[PDB]
Design a protein around this ligand. Structure first.
Ligand code: GLU
Ligand code: GLU
Lengths: 500, 49
């Protein structure tokens, strides 16, 4: 099960065409939908006269099944060269990307990822040849804490998925929330990706015990959120109502299927993306008859239309079928075009006067990759930072349930600073108050009390007063916090006093 | 392959350990004396005599 096309210079791809489901079921939105985008980009590049004249590109596309070990064991085909691979364009999960980068760096094959958002990959000591078209998962935590503090939420529960992405994201979120101030994690939970009442139902039944925390921040995978929602619906319509999800939830309508009322009013974040109209025409025209290139495509059809009853030779992929372009279909084109531009610059420099091609050096090719900027194929300039990342711009969506239909609509933005519109928002309950106790203020000389780390008494500190010298009410009207021993005036019998 | 008996050079041992740790194969070098391999964060399955 693979796609092999031959050309002067060819590239590799890694996509999660199969998912665990509820390699069990095809990933309609983040599988086939991205293979077709990569093939469309390759076809568009080949016909362009300006770029790679006399060089025809090819593809080596494989399946990861959303597993790091499986992708690692099938990425050995890239190094054993069989077909020689100039660069690898496919990586969709941080766990897959890290393991693939570890093997590829040894054999000096450049890699570009279109959907992996993990700060660990920002390290260039251990990942020399890794490049990225999306921002690292460090601005996303800042955006989530900004959303949490803007609406006054200080008592929240956090859930994460075991792995690089979930753990790194939840650690960054906790650090930024502590730095922001007043955001306190009542419960922090982790999920191991095994759907079982032992863990997932226990997570939902352990979030129940803290009723004051009515908001949940989650760093969980695409498949883990589905089990979270299913367990939430089973267990008395959930006890963790508000869900502030990261890009893994994104705006995917598939996970919330049959569990819609659970996610009513949730707020989710995605990378800022603009639709590509050119790919819309390409995808719809891909019939079962004509699209023989994709080996998996037939199976996708059986899932998409629930057909084999005999199929009617009139069904198509259109607005009725909810074509619904995936969010990260613009970064695949950017990655493929960046690699093509780097190869074009390399071959223009090395052998002037000959458009055609012998041996490619990974190090200098990667040096070319880090030093190329260009306007996007149709939407926006593409460039790499010093570490190979992309700038952080995020959009905010909310799972509103209109009477007619349930959908995500944009509710704001975040580029180093947060814009939001509360008026159009709709809530599950009525803002979801998530607080424990009133914050301490220098009201009658300040205080700070122990208890549950999320709770504080904030009583008075009776007596004298000073300006900023309040250290747990420490003495030098004593105030129990006397620091007026510094600025104290000495009074003596004045000359002009009447007693004098 | 239960285990791999090392290498006689530090560069060879490092390059072999990098590939072997991914597939979880223990390694025991008999003649590599570099102190870069003393790190256990990047060389999990490497040991030396
Ligand atoms: N950024 C996510 C995946 C994003 C996606 O697949 O949509 C991760 O690191 O796993
Ligand atoms: N310890 C030496 C090798 C000594 C030997 O092989 O005799 C090295 O790291 O290269």
């Amino acid at each position: 099960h693979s796609i092999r096309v031959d050309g002067d210079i060819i590239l590799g791809g890694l996509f999660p065409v199969h998912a665990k489901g509820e390699c069990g079921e095809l990933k309609k939105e983040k599988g086939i939908h991205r293979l077709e985008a990569m093939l469309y980009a390759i076809d568009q590049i080949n016909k362009d006269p300006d770029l790679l004249s006399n060089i025809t590109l090819g593809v080596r596309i494989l399946d990861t099944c959303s597993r790091d070990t499986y992708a690692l064991e099938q990425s050995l085909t890239f190094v054993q060269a069989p077909d020689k691979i100039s660069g690898v364009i496919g990586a969709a999960a941080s766990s897959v990307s890290i393991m693939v980068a570890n093997i590829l760096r040894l054999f000096k094959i450049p890699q570009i990822s279109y959907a992996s958002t993990a700060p660990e990959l920002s390290d260039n000591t251990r990942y020399d040849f890794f490049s990225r078209v999306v921002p690292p998962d460090s601005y996303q935590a800042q955006a989530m804490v900004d959303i949490v503090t803007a609406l006054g939420w200080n008592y929240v529960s956090t859930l994460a998925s075991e792995g690089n992405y979930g753990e790194s994201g939840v650690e960054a979120f906790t650090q930024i929330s502590r730095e922001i101030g007043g955001v306190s994690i009542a419960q922090s939970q982790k999920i191991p990706r095994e759907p079982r009442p032992g863990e997932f139902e226990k997570i939902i039944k352990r979030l129940l015990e803290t009723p004051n925390a009515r908001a949940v921040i989650m760093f969980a995978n695409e498949d883990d959120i589905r089990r979270i929602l299913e367990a939430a619906k089973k267990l008395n319509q959930s006890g963790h109502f508000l869900w502030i999800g990261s890009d893994s939830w994104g705006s995917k309508i598939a996970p919330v299927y049959q569990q819609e009322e659970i996610a009513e009013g949730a707020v989710t974040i995605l990378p800022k993306r603009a639709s590509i109209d050119g790919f819309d025409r390409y995808f719809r025209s891909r019939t079962l008859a004509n699209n023989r290139r994709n080996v998996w495509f037939a199976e996708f059809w059986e899932e998409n239309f629930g057909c084999k009853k005999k199929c009617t030779g009139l069904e198509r992929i259109a607005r009725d079928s909810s074509y619904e372009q995936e969010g990260k279909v613009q970064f695949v084109i950017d990655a493929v075009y960046s690699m093509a531009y780097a190869l074009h610059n390399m071959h223009k420099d090395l052998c002037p006067g000959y458009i055609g091609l012998s041996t490619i050096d990974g190090k200098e090719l990667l040096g070319y990759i880090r030093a190329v900027n260009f306007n996007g194929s149709a939407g926006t300039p593409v460039t790499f930072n010093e570490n190979g990342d992309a700038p952080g711009r995020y959009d905010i969506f909310q799972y509103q349930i209109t009477n007619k239909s349930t959908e995500y609509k944009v509710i704001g933005h975040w580029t180093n600073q947060l814009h939001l519109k509360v008026e159009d928002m709709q809530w599950a309950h009525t803002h979801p108050a998530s607080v424990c106790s009133l914050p301490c203020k220098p009201g009658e000389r300040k205080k700070t009390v122990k208890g549950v780390p999320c709770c504080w008494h904030c009583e008075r500190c009776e007596g004298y007063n000073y300006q900023v010298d309040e250290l747990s009410c420490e003495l030098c009207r004593p105030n129990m916090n006397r620091t007026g021993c510094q600025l104290i005036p000495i009074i003596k019998l004045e000359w002009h006093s009447p007693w004098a």
